[PDB]
């Protein structure tokens, strides 16, 4: 549980980096 | 022309970084 929520909080900022630059979190958030 | 193609070759790798991590280049490539 701590591993899945740690990778959730790790790759949440990775998808923040993927979505905020305009012009591993779905499955990880689902398992978490 | 050299400035627009330099920013093309600069931000092409930026959108490579944006698209290869799965789960400024459109307008720059159009002007170039």
From Swiss-Prot, chains A, B:
Protein name (Swiss-Prot/TrEMBL): Endophilin-B1
Designated gene of the protein: SH3GLB1
Function in brief: May be required for normal outer mitochondrial membrane dynamics. Required for coatomer-mediated retrograde transport in certain cells. May recruit other proteins to membranes with high curvature. May promote membrane fusion. Involved in activation of caspase-dependent apoptosis by promoting BAX/BAK1 activation. Isoform 1 acts proapoptotic in fibroblasts. Involved in caspase-independent apoptosis during nutrition starvation and involved in the regulation of autophagy. Activates lipid kinase activity of PIK3C3 during autophagy probably by associating with the PI3K complex II (PI3KC3-C2).
Similarity comment text for this entry: Belongs to the endophilin family.
Record text about domains: An N-terminal amphipathic helix, the BAR domain and a second amphipathic helix inserted into helix 1 of the BAR domain (N-BAR domain) induce membrane curvature and bind curved membranes.
Note: HeLa cells lacking SH3GLB1 show dissociation of outer and inner mitochondrial membrane as well as abnormal mitochondrial morphology. Cells overexpressing SH3GLB1 lacking an N-terminal amphipathic helix show a similar phenotype.
Subcellular location: Cytoplasm; Golgi apparatus membrane; Mitochondrion outer membrane; Cytoplasmic vesicle, Autophagosome membrane
Assembly and interaction partners: Homodimer, and heterodimer with SH3GLB2. Binds BAX; induction of apoptosis augments BAX binding. Binds DNM1, HTT, AMPH, BIN1 and ARFGAP1. Interacts with UVRAG; UVRAG bridges the interaction to BECN1 indicative for an association with the PI3K complex II (PI3KC3-C2).
Organism: Homo sapiens (Human)
Expression sites (tissue/organ): Highly expressed in heart, skeletal muscle, kidney and placenta. Detected at lower levels in brain, colon, thymus, spleen, liver, small intestine, lung and peripheral blood leukocytes.
Positions spanned in the full protein: 158 to 209 of 365
């Amino acid at each position: 549980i701590a591993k899945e929520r740690k990778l959730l909080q790790n790759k949440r900022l990775d998808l923040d980096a993927a979505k905020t630059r305009l012009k591993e979190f779905d499955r990880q958030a689902e398992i978490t």
